[PDB]
Amino acid sequence: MADKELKFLVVDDFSTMRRIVRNLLKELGFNNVEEAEDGVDALNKLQAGGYGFVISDWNMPNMDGLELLKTIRADGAMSALPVLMVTAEAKKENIIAAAQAGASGYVVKPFTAATLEEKLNKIFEKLGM
């Protein structure tokens, strides 16, 4: 009812990844997820009000996941959003770039509710999520 109505965004390359993440989030205990077309759409979904998590791929057709991150990381507005990179991409430099950009966490396939809640509990105690 008078909730945070806290919406997750999940913008992967592959729709099945949004099902997987949503379902694992539901195994944990959450509700209220969405998808987007890519990073360009994703940012404007954040600007549909104030989302709770910005979970994404890396290899978007337009604004890549590190540029989506660094846009949220422009601070003053979107700063507080945990971007959580959940992707098929294990490329070590991608992992560096994300950590360097200050992504709130990284996950590579195959992943579970175990690692989902690991990155969540990190942003709980780290950020205050």
Q: Give Cα separations from 33 to 72, 74, 75, 125 (angstroms).
A: 19, 24, 24, 22
How determined?
Answer: NMR
Q: Give Cα separations from 25 to 62, 76, 112 (angstroms).
A: 27, 29, 9
Residues annotated in the binding site, as ranges? Answer: 12-13, 57, 59
Rounded Cα gap, residues 123 and 80, in angstroms: 10
Within 10 angstroms of residue 26's Cβ, the number of other Cβ atoms is 12
Rounded Cα gap, residues 81 and 103, in angstroms: 10
Residues annotated in the binding site for Mg(2+), as ranges? Answer: 12-13, 57, 59
Q: List strands edge to edge, sheet with 53-56.
A: 33-34, 8-11, 53-56, 83-87, 105-108
- Burial label, 56 (beta-carbon count in 10 A; 0-12, 13-18, 19+): buried
Largest CA distance in the chain: 43
The structural domains of the chain, ordered by start, are: 1-129 (3.40.50.2300)
